[PDB]
Amino acid sequence: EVLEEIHPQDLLALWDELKGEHRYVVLTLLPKAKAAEVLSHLSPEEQAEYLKTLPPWRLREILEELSLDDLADALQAVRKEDPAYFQRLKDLLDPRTRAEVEALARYEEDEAGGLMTPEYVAVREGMTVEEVLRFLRRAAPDAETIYYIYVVDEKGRLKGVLSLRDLIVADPRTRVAEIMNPKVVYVRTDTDQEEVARLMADYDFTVLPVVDEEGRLVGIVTVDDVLDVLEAEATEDIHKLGAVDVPDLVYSEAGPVALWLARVRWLVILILTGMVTSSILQGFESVLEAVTALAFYVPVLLGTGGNTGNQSATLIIRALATRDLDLRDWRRVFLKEMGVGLLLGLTLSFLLVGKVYWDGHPLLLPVVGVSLVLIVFFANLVGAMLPFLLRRLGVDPALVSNPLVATLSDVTGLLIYLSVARLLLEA
Amino acid sequence: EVLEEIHPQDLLALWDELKGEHRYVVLTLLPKAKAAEVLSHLSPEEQAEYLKTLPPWRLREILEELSLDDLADALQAVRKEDPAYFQRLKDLLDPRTRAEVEALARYEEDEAGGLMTPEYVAVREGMTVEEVLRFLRRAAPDAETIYYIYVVDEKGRLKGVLSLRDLIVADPRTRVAEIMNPKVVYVRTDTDQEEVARLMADYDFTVLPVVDEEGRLVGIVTVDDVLDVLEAEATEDIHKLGAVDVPDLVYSEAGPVALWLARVRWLVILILTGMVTSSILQGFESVLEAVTALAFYVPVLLGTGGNTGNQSATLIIRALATRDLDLRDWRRVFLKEMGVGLLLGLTLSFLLVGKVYWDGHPLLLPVVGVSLVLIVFFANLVGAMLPFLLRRLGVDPALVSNPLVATLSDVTGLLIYLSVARLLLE
Ligand SMILES: Nc1ncnc2c1ncn2[C@@H]1O[C@H](COP(=O)(O)OP(=O)(O)OP(=O)(O)O)[C@@H](O)[C@H]1O
Ligand SMILES: Nc1ncnc2c1ncn2[C@@H]1O[C@H](COP(=O)(O)OP(=O)(O)OP(=O)(O)O)[C@@H](O)[C@H]1O
Ligand SMILES: [Mg+2]
Ligand SMILES: [Mg+2]
Ligand SMILES: [Mg+2]
Ligand SMILES: [Mg+2]
Ligand SMILES: [Mg+2]
Ligand SMILES: [Mg+2]
Ligand SMILES: [Mg+2]
Ligand SMILES: [Mg+2]
Ligand SMILES: [Mg+2]
Ligand SMILES: [Mg+2]
Ligand SMILES: [Mg+2]
Ligand SMILES: [Mg+2]
Ligand SMILES: [Mg+2]
C-alpha cells in the first residue's frame, strides 16, 4: 500500500523522533532504494552503527544500491570506527564496484575526489547528437546525471562539455564538436572542498568535472553535495569564531567529556594571556593605591573595547571568507575602518563620561573618557588586522575568535588605561 | 573582439580591481548577454548606479537580455534608492516583460515569491512524451530550465512533476500522466527564503515550484539563487554573532558612516550594560578598599566567564540554526553543559590559583579560585541558555551575540566575585 507511496525524507524527518526498534524495522522493510537513500542522509556514527546492526543480505542490497560517493563515505566512517569489520563489510561487494570504491576511498574527504562520483556520462568528440542520445537512453540507468555530458580525448582528459538542452535543440545529424564547449570549467582531485563550493556557486553550475593529476576526467561533483559542504564549512567557521576547536562536532550526539576537551583547549590558551593582565595590574599598584575610582572603570572600558574588537574581527573574517576582501586590500581597509573607530569612540565616550560625571568623579572624567576613546579606537583596529596577519601567515582567520580578541583587548585595554592614568597623574 | 572571448565570471573577478570610469566603459561596451549577467551578479547599489548612469539604449538592451528574477531584483534596488527612475527605467521595458516584472516586485524579496522566475516549462497531462519533447524544443529558447516539466490543470493548479530524463528514457508513445509524479513537493509564495533553502538542500532538488493559496503555479526557484541565499543567510547569522545588525552588509562598498550606524546601535546597548558594572564596583568600594590583590585579579575572572559563555552560546546557537536541536531539548542541555561547566571551571581554576599563589599573593587563594569555578560554570550556563529563550519569543536567537554574552558575563561575574569577597572577607 503505502510502502510504495512514502518518500524517504518523511522517514528522515520522523527519524529524530522514533524508537530504535521500529527504526531498524523501517530500514529492513522499505524498497531497496528508499532505505538506501534514508541511510544516505544520516550521520556517519549512525551509519556505521546500522551497517553493523543490519543483516548481510540487506547489507548487500543497500551497498549495491548506493551512489559511489555516498558509499565510499559510509565505508570510510566504518574504517575510522571499526577497521576490521570495515574490511569484512567490504567483502560483500562486487569486483568492479569494490574496485571503484577502493579507488575512491583513497581520495581525501575534504577534497574534490572525496566529493566526486565516477558515474559521469562521457563521450568521445566524434559522435553526433543522435548517437549521444541513443547512448543516453541505453546508459541512463548507471548514471548520476545525464543532464551534462563531458567530451573526452582518447586518453581521458577534458576536451569539451555539453548541455542536454543543447542536444535536444540541436540538429541530430550535427557532430558534437560543432556544438560543444571547449572552455571547460573544472576542479582537480586535490582541490579543496570549499574551492569547489566557490567555483560551483560562481559559475552557476550543477555538475563540476573532477580531473586527475594528469587531467584525465575521473569523476564529477554535484551541487547537492556541495550545499551540505557549504553548511559544513559555515558551521566550522561559526564554531571556531566561538573559540571551540573541533571541525565536525554534533552537539546532540557528543558526551560531556569531548565537549570538555574541545572547549578546555582554547579556554586554557586564552586564560594564560588572561593572567598577563593580572601581572600587568600588579606593577601599576602605585597609581591604583592612589586613586581608587580608576578600578571602578576597568571593566566597562575593557569589555566595551572587546566588544568593538569582536565587531571588526567578525566583520572582516566574513568579508575574507565570502572572498569579498583580498590580502592586498589590507592597507586600503585600514584607513576605512580607522575613522569609524574614532567615531565609535567619541560617541561611546560621550555616554560613559556622562556617567562618570554622574558617578560623581568629575576629576578623572577625562582620564576615563580619553581612555575609552583610545581603547575603542585601538581594539577596533586590532580586530581588523589580526585576520589579515594570519592570512599573510597562512592560517585560518576564523581562529581569530571573539574570545581571543576579548582577552587581547583586555590586555591592551589595561595597558592603555593604566598608562593613561599614570601619565595624567604626573600632571 | 578578443575582448569578447572572456567569461563573465573572470571579468567579475577583476571588477574589484577596476576604476569607476573603467568599470562604466566595460559594462557599457560588452555583448548584451555578458553585460547583463555581469550586472546581474553585482550588488544592488552599483547595480542601480549603472542602471542610472548607463545610456538609455544600452540600459534598454541590458534590461531586456536580463533574466526576470534578476530584472525584478535590479528594478527593486533602483526602487529602494530612487522611486522615479525606477518607473522611468521600466518605461523602457516591453509589456510582456514589464507585466511579469510588476507581478514579481509585489512579493517580498526575502520570500519565495521574491527570488522566483516565471520562465518555467509547464505541460498538461494530456500529452505524450513525444508531444512534450516537441514542446521543449519549441519553448526552450525562453525558459530558465527545461529539465523539470510541470503538469497542471484546466484552472491552473499543480498536478505533478516530470524530469526530462524520465521523458528521454520513456517510449514516446507513452501518455504523460503515466510517468509523472503527483507527489510533487512545492513551496508557497509567502514562504521564507531560509525555508526554501532548507527544502532544496534536503531533497537534493534543483528547482522548486512556487504556488499561491489556491495551489496554482506562479513560478520556479533555481538552486544557484538558493545557494547565494544560503551564503547570505549564513553571513547574516554570523554578523549577528558579532553584534552587527544589518541584513545584507557588504563591507567592501559600505561607507564609514554606514559601518558606523550598523555597529553603533548594539555597541551602545552594550556600553549601557557596562555602566552597571561600574556602579556594581562602586557600591562594593567598602569591601574593595580592604584588599588590592582582589582588584588585581578581576579582568581574568570576568574575561574567562565571558569566554566560556561565548563558547556555549556559539555551540547552541549554531545547533539551533542547523535544526540539530529543538526548543524542547533545552532541559537536557541544562544538564549536559552543567557538568561540563563544572569540569571546565575546576581545570581552569587549578591553573589560575597556580598564579594566585605564585604572583605573590598567597593571602587567600579561594576568594579567586572558587570564584573562577562559579563564574566559569554560571557564564557557561547563561551563554548556553540565552538563545533558547530568545528563540521561544519568536526572536532570531542569533541576537545572543558574543559581545553580549561577554558583557553579561562582566556583570554576573562581578556580582559572583565581589559577593564571594564580601563573605570570605567577613
Ligand atoms: N564544467 C563546465 N565548464 C564549462 N561550461 C559548462 C560546464 N558545465 C556546464 N557548462 C555550460 O553551461 C551550460 C549548461 O547548460 P544548461 O542548458 O544547463 O544552461 P541553461 O542556463 O539552462 O541554458 P543555456 O545553456 O542556453 O544558457 C552549457 O552551455 C554548457 O556549455
Ligand atoms: N518538486 C518535486 N517534487 C517531487 N518529486 C520531484 C520534484 N522534482 C523532481 N522530482 C523527481 O525527482 C526526479 C528527478 O529526475 P532527475 O533525472 O533530475 O534525477 P537524477 O538523480 O538525475 O536521476 P534519477 O531520477 O534516475 O534518480 C524525477 O523522477 C522527479 O519525478
Ligand atoms: Mg577545511
Ligand atoms: Mg566523500
Ligand atoms: Mg552564483
Ligand atoms: Mg546565471
Ligand atoms: Mg551525491
Ligand atoms: Mg573556512
Ligand atoms: Mg571582555
Ligand atoms: Mg535565476
Ligand atoms: Mg530573514
Ligand atoms: Mg529577488
Ligand atoms: Mg542534501
Ligand atoms: Mg541523491
Ligand atoms: Mg538566521
Author numbering:
A (entry chain A): 23 to 449
B (entry chain B): 23 to 448
Quote what the paper states about this structure.
MgtE is a widely distributed Mg2+ channel in both prokaryotes and eukaryotes. The bacterial MgtE channels are highly selective for Mg2+, and are involved in the maintenance of the intracellular Mg2+ concentration. The full-length structure in the presence of Mg2+ revealed that MgtE forms a homodimer, consisting of five transmembrane helices, one plug helix, and the cytosolic region composed of the N-terminal domain and the tandemly repeated CBS domains. A comparative analysis of the Mg2+-bound and Mg2+-free cytosolic domain structures, together with molecular dynamic simulations, revealed that Mg2+ binding to the cytosolic domain stabilizes the closed conformation of MgtE, suggesting a Mg2+ homeostasis mechanism in which the MgtE cytosolic domain acts as a Mg2+ sensor to regulate the Mg2+ influx.
To gain further insights into the ATP-dependent modulation of the channel gating in MgtE, we determined the crystal structure of the full-length MgtE in complex with ATP at 3.6 Å resolution. The overall structure represents the closed conformation of the channel, and is essentially identical to the previously reported full-length structure, with a root mean squared deviation (RMSD) value of 0.38 Å for all Cα atoms. The electron density for Mg2+ corresponds to the Mg2+-binding sites (Mg1–Mg7) in the previously reported full-length structure. Consistent with the previous structure, the electron density for Mg7 is relatively weak, possibly indicating the weak affinity of the Mg7 site for Mg2+. We also determine the crystal structures of the full-length and the cytosolic domain of MgtE in complex with ATP, which reveal that ATP is recognized by the CBS domain of MgtE. ATP molecules are located proximal to the subunit interface between the N domain in one subunit and the CBS domain in the neighboring subunit. The ATP molecule is exclusively recognized by the CBS domain. Accordingly, while ATP can bind to MgtE to modulate the channel gating, MgtE either lacks or has very low ATPase activity. This conclusion is also supported by the crystal structures of the MgtE–ATP complex, where the γ-phosphate group of ATP is clearly observed. With ATP bound to the cytosolic domain, MgtE closes when the intracellular Mg2+ concentration is above the physiological range (1–2 mM) b.
